[PDB]
Amino acid sequence: SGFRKMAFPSGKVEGCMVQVTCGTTTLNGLWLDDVVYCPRHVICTSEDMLNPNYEDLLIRKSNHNFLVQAGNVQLRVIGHSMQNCVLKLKVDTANPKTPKYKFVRIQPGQTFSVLACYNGSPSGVYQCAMRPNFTIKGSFLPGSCGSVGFNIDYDCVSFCYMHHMELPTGVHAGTDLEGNFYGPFVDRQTAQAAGTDTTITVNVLAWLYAAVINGDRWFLNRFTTTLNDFNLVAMKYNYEPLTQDHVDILGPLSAQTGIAVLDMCASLKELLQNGMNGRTILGSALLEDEFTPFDVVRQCSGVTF
Amino acid sequence: SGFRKMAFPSGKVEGCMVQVTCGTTTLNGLWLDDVVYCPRHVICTSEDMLNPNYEDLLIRKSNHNFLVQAGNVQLRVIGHSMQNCVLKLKVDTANPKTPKYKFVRIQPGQTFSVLACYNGSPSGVYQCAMRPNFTIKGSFLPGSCGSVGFNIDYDCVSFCYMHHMELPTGVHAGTDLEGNFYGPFVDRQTAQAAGTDTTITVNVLAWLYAAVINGDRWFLNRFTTTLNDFNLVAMKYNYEPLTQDHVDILGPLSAQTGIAVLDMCASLKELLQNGMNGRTILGSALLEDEFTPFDVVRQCSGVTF
Ligand SMILES: *[C@@](O)(CO)[C@H](C[C@@H]1CCNC1=O)NC(=O)[C@H](CC(C)C)NC(=O)c1cc2c(OC)cccc2[nH]1
Ligand SMILES: *[C@@](O)(CO)[C@H](C[C@@H]1CCNC1=O)NC(=O)[C@H](CC(C)C)NC(=O)c1cc2c(OC)cccc2[nH]1
């Protein structure tokens, strides 16, 4: 039993974390096979960051301009290409620690593990969720650019995020491993705001099932609601609408506890209208939306990786 | 910026997790060099765990009664012995992924990272804190015995916890890597109850320092107390008394903010006596206690490994 914010074991990613230096800028790279992936603004100077023409700046660079570091071993760049905001540095040596990998673009509401890195060395691992406004509530310091977000299925690591910047509100934005930004953000040194951030509803419902599975039942009530009537109240409190797919995903959680999904919705409806009155749920004074139904099932059901 | 629970990179510990089977019972083991460490109750069947005589059970066990597997590959046991509640199995092969390691016994309040494992395959990693009643509020499922808790100091990995059981209350208990239980618990199929939990006072002070390092400093009292006077008032609110390593460990955080430890102690006593009056600190208004002063230094500074 128990329920913690759990990230995937990071060992498969640590073997790919390298250091990419170009000029006087240093960030992190992901060394898969004979390619090294890193944010493209490593090639930028301090003056270039304001308004960078990247294909312009990239054409003015060469292979020997990039300093790639893997441990205490300098990796030689034998070629360079650019895919959106991601730089691709081909090297002479392949990574023996390359796992089975894939490049996916997660949908908002999904979760992934972040391996915070500085100068190509892993600092810490933690779990994030892609918020509906395509930002993440991460923990990043200058030099964390190039850190990747990931999920592991069987022995396959599915990369989905690369860190790029920090918004003025403390949240963070980045790209997938193809270079496409999550959200309306761009890789320039400007103050960028995001859209209004809604609450991932189906994540809150799975979190409540996790509390019931762990013996916390103070929030349940003897009422039920229709899917539309719940979405009507949920929309009023800036919650994403619950879909028939979301209800289907919560199926196993409803089966284990015997509480219908539409029953849990009446509890979340009550919680939004009345508050928690100073009590806690799973030790939290707030409604938590950073756990997917899989995250709860993989913990509470007993699934292992 | 961004502050959240952050676990150590689990790669170095991943390469030390193995499977230990005795008859029909399977748990997890820690393989460092040519010795595998695991809970001693692996030599038990279902009815053996009720009232086990561990010295009498080990006398009827041989080296070939032990199945040690790295993945699916078996490591032959060339020697077995017992230290308290852990089992030591000498293996014919030395682990090439063995890092520089240590066996340490941590104090209630210190944090570590748990790498949850099932059948020798790491499942997830999360940060825990040792509660003052010597339990941990973990997240374990059947087959998780042998999962280790650890801290990383530079290139050294310090092992400090080996999981053993789950209390009726939902929390968990275990031993260090020397076999000695944390608390008054024993490895048996017995209903065991921990003592009354308290708040890790040194950890809320580091968290208040973490808030001061950022924006929130609204709770600064401009008052002081003696170490003795605060300890007497803190115990009246189910808070742990401050020891000596507590005051000295808060040193770097006090020098960074210029706010003395005893000055911060009076700010916290003001928050215990009159509450927070609907004000929030670092987001959640719940007085977090699972961040050590190192967790603040390590996160706010970007210490890598
Ligand atoms: C990378 O590590 C550098 O390659 C760095 C990581 C973030 C900054 C510190 N903490 C982080 O998460 N990324 C940046 O510094 C980026 C630069 C590229 C072009 C994206 N810039 C920002 O994150 C940034 C710039 C500004 C700003 O200007 C003006 C004004 C307000 C906020 C802001 N964030
Ligand atoms: C290990 O996997 C056993 O190898 C197992 C892990 C716990 C069980 C599931 N989740 C866990 O954290 N450990 C145990 O089963 C131990 C075995 C002891 C050390 C011999 N037992 C318990 O954790 C346990 C026993 C009892 C109990 O009795 C009956 C009554 C109430 C709670 C309880 N927990």
XYZ file of C-alpha atoms and ligand atoms in Angstrom:
678
model
C 0.000 0.000 0.000
C 0.910 3.684 0.097
C 0.960 6.303 -2.641
C 3.947 8.478 -3.561
C 4.875 10.539 -6.594
C 6.969 7.916 -8.356
C 9.322 8.459 -11.285
C 10.735 5.758 -13.519
C 14.208 4.380 -12.750
C 16.562 6.758 -14.535
C 19.480 4.394 -15.199
C 18.640 3.902 -18.872
C 18.743 7.673 -19.417
C 21.878 8.393 -17.349
C 23.950 6.346 -19.803
C 22.971 8.796 -22.562
C 23.505 12.113 -20.741
C 26.437 13.952 -22.328
C 27.763 17.521 -22.258
C 27.468 19.780 -25.313
C 29.575 22.950 -25.391
C 29.704 25.483 -28.229
C 31.458 28.803 -27.712
C 30.719 29.807 -24.113
C 27.357 28.006 -23.780
C 27.071 24.587 -22.128
C 23.991 22.379 -21.805
C 22.997 18.707 -21.831
C 22.790 16.230 -24.688
C 21.104 12.854 -25.244
C 23.529 10.377 -26.828
C 21.554 7.657 -28.627
C 23.528 5.460 -31.064
C 25.926 7.775 -32.981
C 23.714 10.883 -32.678
C 23.649 13.431 -29.851
C 20.464 15.458 -29.350
C 20.512 18.842 -27.623
C 18.691 22.193 -27.748
C 19.666 24.214 -30.802
C 20.343 27.414 -28.831
C 23.682 26.020 -27.642
C 25.053 27.619 -30.838
C 23.772 31.045 -29.752
C 25.796 33.823 -28.170
C 24.409 36.040 -25.420
C 23.514 38.612 -28.082
C 22.037 35.917 -30.344
C 19.422 34.856 -27.773
C 17.241 37.968 -28.145
C 16.268 37.363 -31.791
C 18.047 34.326 -33.255
C 17.984 33.342 -36.922
C 18.917 29.718 -36.359
C 19.492 28.441 -39.903
C 21.540 31.616 -40.314
C 23.611 30.929 -37.190
C 23.880 27.184 -37.833
C 25.316 27.682 -41.326
C 28.066 29.755 -39.731
C 29.137 26.826 -37.558
C 31.190 23.695 -38.183
C 31.702 20.298 -36.570
C 34.779 21.310 -34.562
C 32.838 24.229 -33.049
C 30.865 21.786 -30.877
C 32.583 20.369 -27.789
C 30.858 17.111 -26.802
C 31.772 15.480 -23.485
C 30.823 11.949 -22.393
C 32.339 11.413 -18.960
C 35.993 12.372 -19.374
C 35.965 11.336 -23.058
C 35.669 14.031 -25.718
C 33.282 12.927 -28.471
C 34.216 14.102 -31.967
C 31.439 15.658 -34.049
C 31.492 14.350 -37.628
C 28.283 16.081 -38.740
C 25.469 18.364 -37.602
C 21.840 18.856 -38.613
C 18.859 20.699 -37.150
C 15.292 19.468 -36.622
C 13.170 22.366 -35.287
C 14.642 23.465 -31.914
C 16.719 20.276 -31.513
C 20.307 20.068 -32.657
C 21.582 16.753 -34.024
C 25.328 16.170 -33.622
C 26.549 13.031 -35.377
C 29.651 11.552 -33.743
C 32.202 8.894 -34.639
C 31.438 6.555 -31.716
C 28.120 4.902 -30.905
C 26.699 4.706 -27.391
C 26.896 1.137 -26.016
C 24.433 2.190 -23.302
C 21.785 3.056 -25.909
C 18.513 1.428 -24.805
C 15.585 0.482 -26.970
C 14.093 3.921 -27.537
C 11.329 5.774 -29.351
C 10.292 9.397 -29.859
C 6.699 10.128 -28.837
C 4.692 13.314 -28.310
C 2.657 12.958 -25.122
C -0.817 14.446 -24.921
C -1.657 16.975 -22.188
C -2.580 15.318 -18.913
C -0.077 12.490 -19.365
C 2.888 12.030 -17.030
C 6.604 11.403 -17.486
C 9.849 11.251 -15.521
C 12.381 14.095 -15.709
C 16.114 13.511 -15.185
C 17.486 16.891 -14.120
C 21.041 17.227 -15.422
C 23.818 19.817 -15.319
C 26.987 19.598 -17.446
C 26.024 16.092 -18.563
C 25.738 14.652 -15.051
C 22.432 13.537 -13.483
C 21.327 15.615 -10.491
C 17.894 14.187 -9.703
C 14.830 12.420 -11.045
C 11.212 13.442 -10.490
C 7.757 13.004 -12.000
C 5.896 15.656 -14.003
C 2.635 16.018 -15.903
C 2.060 17.942 -19.129
C -0.432 20.535 -17.915
C -3.311 21.487 -20.250
C -1.511 24.746 -21.128
C 1.537 22.714 -22.273
C 3.727 23.777 -19.353
C 5.174 21.608 -16.600
C 5.579 22.395 -12.904
C 9.189 21.264 -12.869
C 12.354 22.120 -10.960
C 15.100 23.559 -13.157
C 18.164 25.786 -12.783
C 20.441 27.432 -15.377
C 22.289 24.632 -17.145
C 19.398 22.145 -17.050
C 18.673 22.660 -20.760
C 18.867 19.341 -22.575
C 17.358 17.353 -19.710
C 14.800 14.902 -21.069
C 11.421 13.609 -19.969
C 10.715 9.927 -20.344
C 8.606 6.878 -19.750
C 9.656 3.254 -19.711
C 7.631 0.397 -21.135
C 9.204 -3.031 -20.750
C 12.793 -2.250 -21.672
C 11.893 0.629 -24.036
C 12.447 4.246 -23.076
C 10.051 6.599 -24.787
C 11.428 10.108 -24.853
C 8.884 12.889 -24.943
C 10.341 16.083 -23.551
C 13.498 18.186 -23.734
C 13.897 21.190 -21.452
C 14.397 24.589 -23.061
C 13.313 27.418 -20.825
C 11.722 28.740 -17.694
C 8.654 30.966 -17.787
C 8.472 34.126 -15.635
C 5.865 32.385 -13.444
C 8.344 29.675 -12.409
C 6.942 26.954 -14.690
C 8.902 25.378 -17.544
C 8.417 24.759 -21.259
C 10.211 22.586 -23.769
C 10.011 20.428 -26.867
C 9.597 16.794 -27.772
C 12.602 14.916 -29.125
C 11.659 16.105 -32.632
C 12.131 19.768 -31.668
C 8.483 20.867 -31.649
C 7.609 23.006 -28.635
C 4.788 22.054 -26.296
C 2.658 25.191 -26.325
C 2.989 28.589 -27.994
C 6.590 29.064 -26.874
C 9.762 29.845 -28.818
C 13.434 29.577 -28.057
C 14.325 33.196 -27.483
C 15.227 35.142 -24.354
C 11.851 36.827 -23.934
C 9.152 36.904 -21.275
C 6.515 34.436 -22.482
C 3.147 33.726 -20.874
C 0.973 30.646 -21.293
C -2.763 30.235 -21.580
C -4.940 29.776 -18.531
C -4.189 26.486 -16.779
C -7.121 24.145 -16.180
C -7.137 21.172 -13.812
C -6.739 17.683 -15.280
C -10.039 16.230 -14.089
C -9.538 12.513 -14.787
C -6.230 12.769 -12.922
C -8.040 14.149 -9.864
C -10.576 11.314 -10.040
C -7.826 8.683 -10.175
C -6.154 10.433 -7.234
C -9.376 10.116 -5.226
C -9.571 6.410 -6.076
C -5.982 6.135 -4.838
C -7.036 7.687 -1.526
C -9.959 5.265 -1.207
C -7.723 2.295 -2.049
C -5.441 3.502 0.765
C -8.216 3.764 3.363
C -9.181 7.449 3.024
C -12.950 7.726 2.525
C -13.874 11.014 4.232
C -14.654 12.706 0.893
C -17.094 10.151 -0.548
C -20.826 10.872 -0.429
C -24.120 9.067 -1.040
C -24.936 10.930 -4.262
C -24.500 10.428 -8.000
C -24.459 12.684 -11.045
C -24.701 12.562 -14.812
C -21.589 13.057 -16.926
C -22.896 16.352 -18.319
C -23.990 17.751 -14.948
C -20.505 17.009 -13.618
C -18.802 18.663 -16.598
C -21.074 21.689 -16.144
C -19.917 22.225 -12.557
C -16.347 21.173 -13.376
C -16.139 23.724 -16.202
C -17.282 26.363 -13.705
C -14.204 25.617 -11.565
C -11.713 25.577 -14.483
C -11.610 21.782 -14.828
C -11.168 19.952 -18.115
C -14.295 18.101 -19.294
C -14.510 14.402 -18.479
C -14.941 12.273 -21.600
C -16.489 8.847 -22.075
C -12.931 7.682 -22.756
C -11.803 9.064 -19.389
C -14.651 7.217 -17.655
C -13.584 4.045 -19.469
C -9.972 4.553 -18.354
C -11.144 4.824 -14.733
C -12.902 1.458 -15.146
C -10.344 -0.680 -13.295
C -10.158 1.884 -10.483
C -13.951 1.859 -10.162
C -13.975 -1.950 -10.184
C -11.370 -2.351 -7.430
C -13.161 0.040 -5.055
C -16.757 -0.663 -6.084
C -17.349 3.097 -6.402
C -18.788 4.105 -9.765
C -16.974 6.792 -11.736
C -20.152 8.884 -11.698
C -20.211 8.369 -7.921
C -16.670 9.734 -7.599
C -17.756 12.661 -9.783
C -20.384 13.618 -7.200
C -17.614 13.617 -4.587
C -15.376 15.843 -6.716
C -18.424 18.041 -7.352
C -18.962 18.397 -3.598
C -15.251 19.044 -3.029
C -15.186 21.897 -5.551
C -18.278 23.571 -4.070
C -17.534 23.111 -0.350
C -13.748 22.843 -0.058
C -11.811 20.467 2.156
C -12.621 22.321 5.420
C -9.014 22.048 6.590
C -8.794 18.272 6.151
C -6.333 16.396 3.942
C -6.546 13.791 1.187
C -3.487 11.518 0.949
C -1.706 14.099 3.098
C -2.458 16.940 0.662
C -4.471 20.076 1.399
C -5.114 20.520 -2.346
C -6.733 18.467 -5.092
C -3.844 16.765 -6.894
C -4.028 16.331 -10.679
C -0.520 15.073 -11.538
C -1.320 11.333 -11.314
C -2.793 9.529 -14.307
C -5.172 6.566 -13.888
C -2.274 4.344 -14.962
C -0.098 5.903 -12.246
C -2.701 4.920 -9.644
C -3.309 1.444 -11.088
C 0.417 0.760 -11.505
C 0.819 1.587 -7.808
C -2.413 0.337 -6.164
C -3.211 -2.622 -8.395
C 0.322 -3.918 -7.993
C 1.795 -3.687 -11.489
C 5.590 -3.661 -11.751
C 8.221 -2.565 -14.288
C 13.522 27.729 -9.745
C 10.738 25.305 -8.876
C 10.686 23.288 -5.649
C 9.497 19.698 -5.385
C 10.498 16.333 -3.931
C 13.491 15.128 -5.946
C 14.964 11.628 -5.868
C 18.567 10.713 -6.561
C 19.457 9.183 -9.942
C 18.802 5.479 -9.434
C 21.145 4.121 -12.112
C 23.987 3.104 -9.804
C 21.580 1.222 -7.529
C 19.707 -0.379 -10.453
C 22.813 -2.326 -11.478
C 22.892 -3.951 -8.040
C 19.339 -5.340 -7.807
C 18.915 -9.111 -8.114
C 16.321 -11.792 -7.411
C 16.589 -14.164 -4.442
C 14.445 -17.305 -4.256
C 14.348 -19.989 -1.558
C 11.901 -22.747 -2.431
C 8.741 -20.864 -3.384
C 9.503 -17.516 -1.700
C 10.973 -14.689 -3.786
C 12.076 -11.179 -2.836
C 14.789 -8.724 -3.905
C 18.511 -8.659 -3.208
C 21.371 -6.173 -3.342
C 24.421 -7.457 -5.242
C 27.624 -5.572 -4.386
C 30.897 -7.164 -5.509
C 30.607 -10.881 -4.675
C 27.975 -10.694 -1.899
C 24.180 -10.453 -2.197
C 22.221 -8.868 0.661
C 18.529 -9.595 1.213
C 16.039 -10.014 4.076
C 16.628 -13.245 5.967
C 12.942 -14.246 5.864
C 13.406 -15.484 2.284
C 14.067 -18.938 3.792
C 10.504 -18.991 5.139
C 7.343 -20.574 3.797
C 3.874 -19.223 4.592
C 3.460 -20.901 7.983
C 7.119 -20.379 8.879
C 6.761 -16.610 9.120
C 4.236 -16.790 11.986
C 6.762 -17.728 14.702
C 10.094 -18.253 12.919
C 13.257 -19.635 14.494
C 15.729 -18.084 12.082
C 18.851 -19.813 13.417
C 17.113 -23.201 13.309
C 15.812 -22.587 9.778
C 19.233 -21.571 8.445
C 20.747 -24.810 9.768
C 18.519 -26.793 7.379
C 19.476 -24.604 4.393
C 22.447 -25.118 2.076
C 24.136 -23.005 -0.583
C 22.267 -24.853 -3.342
C 18.936 -24.022 -1.663
C 19.321 -20.402 -2.842
C 18.442 -19.079 -6.259
C 20.209 -15.802 -7.048
C 19.377 -14.334 -10.458
C 20.513 -11.201 -12.278
C 17.576 -10.875 -14.635
C 17.225 -14.460 -15.842
C 20.917 -15.368 -15.451
C 21.646 -17.359 -12.293
C 24.560 -16.567 -9.972
C 25.760 -19.608 -8.040
C 25.876 -19.225 -4.256
C 29.318 -20.201 -2.945
C 28.632 -19.208 0.668
C 25.872 -18.059 3.013
C 25.744 -16.412 6.431
C 23.422 -14.310 8.565
C 23.712 -10.871 10.156
C 20.675 -9.918 12.199
C 17.699 -9.739 9.838
C 19.577 -9.736 6.534
C 21.004 -12.653 4.571
C 24.491 -12.575 3.044
C 25.039 -14.867 0.046
C 28.532 -14.993 -1.431
C 28.239 -15.387 -5.205
C 30.672 -16.892 -7.693
C 30.753 -13.699 -9.787
C 31.715 -10.215 -8.721
C 29.297 -7.495 -9.798
C 30.953 -5.296 -12.470
C 28.366 -2.558 -11.805
C 29.368 -2.295 -8.134
C 29.864 1.392 -7.258
C 31.727 2.930 -4.364
C 29.252 2.290 -1.563
C 28.712 2.579 2.181
C 26.391 1.087 4.788
C 25.060 3.864 7.025
C 22.393 4.095 9.719
C 20.425 7.313 9.304
C 18.490 9.307 11.896
C 14.734 9.962 11.996
C 14.292 12.943 9.714
C 16.978 12.077 7.192
C 15.709 11.405 3.677
C 16.657 8.764 1.132
C 15.540 7.502 -2.271
C 13.746 4.148 -2.501
C 14.105 2.101 -5.695
C 11.024 -0.119 -5.601
C 11.828 -3.522 -7.098
C 9.808 -6.621 -7.962
C 11.487 -9.886 -9.012
C 14.820 -8.089 -9.286
C 13.482 -5.540 -11.787
C 13.381 -1.915 -10.566
C 9.844 -0.536 -10.833
C 10.114 3.068 -9.638
C 12.080 5.555 -7.571
C 10.740 8.040 -5.022
C 12.056 10.084 -2.113
C 11.146 9.100 1.447
C 11.818 10.473 4.918
C 12.486 8.464 8.016
C 9.658 9.310 10.418
C 10.486 9.946 14.096
C 8.574 6.774 15.031
C 11.031 4.872 12.763
C 8.503 4.129 10.016
C 8.466 5.417 6.451
C 5.379 6.544 4.535
C 6.372 4.526 1.492
C 4.603 2.778 -1.374
C 5.208 -0.977 -1.491
C 3.339 -3.951 -2.939
C 3.760 -7.731 -2.455
C 7.211 -8.803 -3.593
C 8.913 -5.526 -2.626
C 11.064 -6.867 0.221
C 14.714 -6.241 -0.554
C 14.062 -2.833 -2.101
C 16.735 -0.460 -0.830
C 16.717 3.159 0.227
C 19.772 5.237 -0.502
C 21.504 8.573 -0.576
C 24.247 9.623 -2.937
C 27.325 11.523 -1.863
C 29.419 12.453 -4.899
C 30.323 9.136 -6.507
C 29.530 7.216 -3.353
C 26.233 5.486 -2.784
C 25.205 5.083 0.806
C 22.830 2.277 1.512
C 20.669 2.961 4.537
C 17.427 0.965 4.210
C 16.217 -2.484 3.172
C 12.453 -2.931 3.019
C 10.880 -5.679 5.111
C 7.248 -5.132 5.935
C 4.078 -3.106 5.937
C 2.320 -2.169 9.163
C -1.483 -2.454 9.494
C -1.602 1.335 9.476
C -0.288 1.479 5.916
C 3.272 2.640 6.636
C 6.390 0.498 6.256
C 9.364 -0.642 8.317
C 12.724 -2.163 7.543
C 16.374 -2.556 8.443
C 19.686 -0.992 7.529
C 22.149 -3.006 5.452
C 23.581 -4.521 8.658
C 20.304 -6.310 9.436
C 19.173 -4.153 12.367
C 15.577 -2.972 12.267
C 14.615 0.656 12.378
C 12.386 0.783 15.440
C 10.939 -1.875 17.738
C 9.763 -4.059 14.854
C 10.567 -7.698 14.097
C 10.449 -9.694 10.858
C 7.380 -11.836 11.504
C 3.775 -12.117 10.327
C 2.641 -10.191 13.400
C 0.427 -7.138 13.797
C 2.930 -4.443 14.796
C 2.110 -0.848 15.731
C 4.556 2.047 15.669
C 4.776 4.768 18.279
C 3.095 8.136 17.999
C 4.540 10.069 15.070
C 5.864 13.608 15.489
C 6.874 16.397 13.120
C 10.461 16.583 11.876
C 11.171 20.056 13.238
C 14.562 20.462 11.548
C 12.885 19.704 8.212
C 10.170 22.357 8.508
C 12.869 24.899 9.384
C 14.828 24.004 6.248
C 11.543 24.335 4.356
C 10.976 27.764 5.911
C 14.530 28.618 4.858
C 13.674 27.359 1.367
C 10.702 29.732 1.278
C 12.884 32.618 2.478
C 15.430 31.873 -0.262
C 12.556 32.432 -2.698
C 9.755 34.965 -2.328
C 7.919 34.007 0.854
C 9.304 35.561 4.042
C 6.061 36.920 5.556
C 6.510 34.770 8.689
C 9.723 36.418 9.925
C 9.170 37.036 13.636
C 12.189 39.140 14.688
C 12.087 37.111 17.915
C 14.329 34.452 19.409
C 14.424 31.621 21.906
C 16.908 29.321 23.542
C 17.448 25.876 22.067
C 16.047 24.548 25.349
C 12.986 26.816 25.376
C 11.992 26.027 21.786
C 12.419 22.283 22.351
C 10.042 22.452 25.324
C 7.391 24.378 23.386
C 7.808 22.286 20.224
C 7.087 19.012 22.037
C 3.761 20.511 23.153
C 2.716 20.490 19.465
C 3.938 16.951 18.650
C 7.130 18.367 17.129
C 10.530 16.741 17.476
C 13.056 18.492 19.738
C 16.114 19.941 18.060
C 19.315 17.988 18.626
C 22.869 19.293 17.962
C 23.376 18.026 14.413
C 20.049 19.748 13.736
C 21.333 23.243 14.581
C 24.680 22.701 12.845
C 23.034 21.230 9.743
C 20.807 24.314 9.387
C 24.019 26.375 9.304
C 24.565 26.864 5.561
C 20.881 27.733 5.110
C 21.089 30.282 7.932
C 24.222 31.885 6.477
C 22.660 32.044 3.003
C 19.623 33.960 4.293
C 21.305 35.762 7.193
C 18.499 34.573 9.496
C 19.768 32.826 12.619
C 18.580 29.321 13.473
C 17.193 30.405 16.846
C 15.572 33.372 15.096
C 13.920 30.988 12.630
C 12.910 28.815 15.596
C 10.898 31.690 17.072
C 9.229 32.279 13.706
C 8.110 28.631 13.686
C 6.862 28.797 17.291
C 4.785 31.821 16.261
C 3.273 29.641 13.510
C 2.563 26.788 15.957
C 0.843 28.942 18.589
C -1.298 31.236 16.410
C -1.498 29.200 13.208
C -0.951 30.630 9.744
C -4.188 32.647 9.564
C -5.071 31.549 6.061
C -1.654 32.377 4.664
C 0.431 30.136 2.484
C 4.122 29.296 2.503
C 5.808 28.019 -0.699
C 2.436 27.238 -2.226
C 0.843 24.650 0.056
C -0.135 25.934 3.481
C 0.734 22.663 5.235
C 4.145 23.127 6.899
C 6.066 20.457 4.988
C 8.513 18.307 6.951
C 10.033 15.846 4.475
C 12.816 18.065 3.103
C 16.151 17.943 4.897
C 18.437 20.998 4.833
C 20.546 19.103 2.287
C 17.441 18.519 0.161
C 17.145 22.311 0.061
C 20.842 22.851 -0.692
C 20.919 20.042 -3.215
C 17.814 21.185 -5.075
C 18.278 24.966 -4.923
C 21.921 24.686 -6.040
C 21.904 21.909 -8.635
C 24.318 19.400 -7.111
C 25.013 16.583 -9.577
C 26.547 13.131 -9.199
C 19.032 26.576 -20.433
O 19.671 25.789 -19.466
C 20.075 27.369 -21.221
O 20.416 26.675 -22.391
C 18.065 27.547 -19.755
C 17.256 26.801 -18.693
C 16.144 27.800 -17.981
C 16.650 28.835 -17.602
C 16.998 28.673 -15.933
N 16.205 27.800 -15.440
C 15.538 27.097 -16.652
O 14.738 26.227 -16.615
N 17.195 28.108 -20.773
C 17.118 29.549 -20.952
O 17.762 30.267 -20.266
C 16.212 30.135 -22.036
C 17.084 30.473 -23.244
C 16.600 29.817 -24.541
C 16.555 30.871 -25.645
C 15.216 29.188 -24.392
N 15.572 31.358 -21.581
C 14.643 31.379 -20.466
O 14.381 30.385 -19.878
C 14.005 32.699 -20.043
C 14.309 33.953 -20.564
C 13.524 34.874 -19.929
C 13.412 36.440 -20.081
O 14.223 37.104 -21.010
C 13.995 38.482 -21.105
C 12.437 37.210 -19.229
C 11.584 36.488 -18.247
C 11.703 34.992 -18.114
C 12.727 34.199 -19.012
N 13.028 32.859 -19.091
C 7.662 -8.729 1.287
O 7.420 -8.710 -0.092
C 7.883 -10.167 1.754
O 8.998 -10.715 1.107
C 6.462 -8.143 2.028
C 6.251 -6.693 1.595
C 4.939 -6.056 2.375
C 3.932 -6.684 2.121
C 3.107 -5.863 0.863
N 3.441 -4.631 0.900
C 4.660 -4.547 1.856
O 5.265 -3.575 2.155
N 6.720 -8.213 3.455
C 5.814 -8.948 4.322
O 4.866 -9.490 3.863
C 6.095 -9.033 5.824
C 6.732 -10.394 6.097
C 7.368 -10.427 7.483
C 8.632 -9.571 7.483
C 7.745 -11.870 7.815
N 4.866 -8.909 6.589
C 4.079 -7.687 6.572
O 4.421 -6.762 5.918
C 2.792 -7.600 7.390
C 2.279 -8.602 8.203
C 1.121 -8.149 8.762
C 0.104 -8.826 9.758
O 0.331 -10.129 10.214
C -0.572 -11.063 9.696
C -1.115 -8.074 10.218
C -1.350 -6.693 9.724
C -0.368 -6.055 8.775
C 0.904 -6.855 8.302
N 1.939 -6.525 7.459
